[PDB]
Amino acid sequence: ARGPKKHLKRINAPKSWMLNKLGGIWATRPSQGPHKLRESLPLSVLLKERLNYALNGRDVTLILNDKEQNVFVDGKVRRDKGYPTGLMDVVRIEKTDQSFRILYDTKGRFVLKSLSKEEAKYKLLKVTAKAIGPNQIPYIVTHDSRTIRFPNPEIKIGDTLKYDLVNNKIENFAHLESGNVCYIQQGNNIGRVGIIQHIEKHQGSFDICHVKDAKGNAFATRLGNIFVLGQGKKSWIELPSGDGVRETILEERKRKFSY
Amino acid sequence: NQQYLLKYEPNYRLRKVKILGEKPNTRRSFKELKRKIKRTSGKAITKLLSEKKGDTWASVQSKKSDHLKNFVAK
Amino acid sequence: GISRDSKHKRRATGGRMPVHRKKRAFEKGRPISMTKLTTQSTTITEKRRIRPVRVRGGHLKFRALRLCEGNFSWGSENITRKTKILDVKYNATNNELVRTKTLVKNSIVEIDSTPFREWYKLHYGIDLGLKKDRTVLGNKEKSRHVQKRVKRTKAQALEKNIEEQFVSQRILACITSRPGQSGRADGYILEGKELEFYIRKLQSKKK
């Protein structure tokens, strides 16, 4: 192909953005950042269609360009129409001191969870890779594309850390092993939260995992899609749509219109 | 603050309250100046530019500003 | 646009194979770069010449066209000094490369023993010049000179082939570097397995 793509089509932009089909023809294309294209929510989407603080396109252009700084992502200022806010992030709306979790539904739509000045401090990080680099030093990396220097050594590659944004400090981690709580970042099963049952590795190039939860449903997904929302039953963050558990179309009806 | 309203609202909503004014036909001429300029050396270009249909943003502001001082009330 | 697309071939079953794509730029194929030697400036003044080529990523790749000095390492001892290469002999790939003293990654050549001779002398007290004067030590045997012994006694049984080499001034070694790629020419000094062998190619080659 000519070179590298550079736009994005209304029609082609992820169902996670709950986008306007009739809308236009395009859609703000996520900027190369911390999260992958599909797994992200560009700010313009976050304020216009989400919060609804903005509206028309120029509305954003003001907000992120205005010399006041109205948007914060993980304790930092952002002024990019399409910064890819990803899973388990913390976004603050300066002018109102609003704090949000970037989390998927139970139906897989990006949801905004309101946090208390309390959780707004800690953010959950999942461990990408772990190896030693320059001059005998250990480095850990998080999905959030965080690069960590001198990390606690009791941390295996597929771990989950709790991060104190305020001090850029770590605390209480927890690997994925039979008996923990987890969130699935993507898949025919995303947005779910349950107890890890067991992890059968097949090495041939793809390991799998099982899970249980509230109504004790059986879940199946690939490791790469498991995010440890916590150690031993206690979750670490407040979940959207009540608990991370979806209902039969049948259970939804009976709960709402009670059929 | 009407002083906020004046900074945020769109240029088109302002001419609507009869505060900003006109919306003259830029297209045609701008396309024609491109014509000449694209074919000249700085010397004249500057001169030409001193003739492209008005309505600078710098101009939009001074007019926005005037509504600012001259208005006060409620 | 000397390309290298595998399209101008014939699939397994030798039937010609179709094309709809003009040669695309990423199938680049740069002009070969034969590499000669200045161990004979009879004409060639400018000793060594290396031209840098602008490669993909944006990097540069230095290309060796003409040379005269490379770097070599003595396997056994773990020594490595920059020396002057002499004449190329037996290129394996083809004998023409030898006829044009061209430098292939694996071209077997000769070098100046000087740096190695100089070193083997300082660390063992053995010059390797014609056999008789063999050693050259100190006058008094009380202090640190006691080490040149300890090492020398390490039954430095340097193959009967390594020995002859030094004295003759010439040294056998093969190269390990793409001149047309990095611009340099580095090689290891020949020994045991291959030495014995490559030499054979040379004994029988001429005889």
């Binding site: 090495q203 041939g204 190039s205 | - | 595998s6 071939k9 397994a12 396997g75 056994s76 037996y90 394996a92 694996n106 039954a155 049984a157 193959e159 290891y188 020949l190 020994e191 045991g192 397995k193 291959e194 030495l195 062998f197 490559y198 054979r200 190619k201």
Partner: protein, 157 residues
């Protein structure tokens, strides 16, 4: 003198020890490149105490194996350390609701270690492109007997 020269003009290893080994004049000097692709595969005894210098081997080289792993019958023994395996599968036919027979032929590389034979089942791994066709290396060989035509032989192995 044989495994080394044998026509070709030299045959070392990836781990250039050799001649230098004469430095460790006491322990074991005769080192050869040792490896283990793992993936639930035993490393051939013959592979270790061999004199063979095959760079295209999965135990004697920096040749990896990844993803696709195959089992198929062998067709030909000719070619230098390369063999053709034939796989026999059925294809379904939407309309008639039935199947037909079909066979894909595969270029496989064989490290000297295991000994070939024509008409035996073989296990190939997914190794990087080694040539126009080759893209599979043998990792586990099972000897088998077929009395005659290898072509006639068709087994949903």
């Amino acid at each position: 003198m044989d495994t080394q020269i044998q026509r070709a003009y030299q045959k070392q290893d990836g781990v250039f020890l050799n001649s230098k080994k004469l430095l460790a004049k006491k322990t074991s000097a005769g080192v050869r490149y040792y490896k283990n692709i793992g993936l639930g595969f035993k490393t051939p005894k013959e592979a270790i105490e061999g004199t063979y210098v095959d760079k295209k081997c999965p135990f004697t080289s920096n040749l990896s194996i990844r993803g696709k792993i195959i089992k198929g019958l062998v067709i030909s023994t000719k070619m230098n350390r390369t063999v053709i395996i034939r796989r026999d599968y059925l294809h379904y036919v939407r309309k008639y609701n039935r199947y037909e027979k079909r066979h894909r032929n595969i270029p496989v590389h064989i490290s000297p270690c295991f000994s070939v034979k024509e008409g035996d089942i073989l296990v190939a791994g997914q190794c990087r492109p080694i040539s126009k066709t080759v893209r599979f290396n043998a990792l586990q060989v099972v000897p088998n007997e077929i009395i005659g035509s290898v072509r006639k032989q068709f087994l949903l192995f």
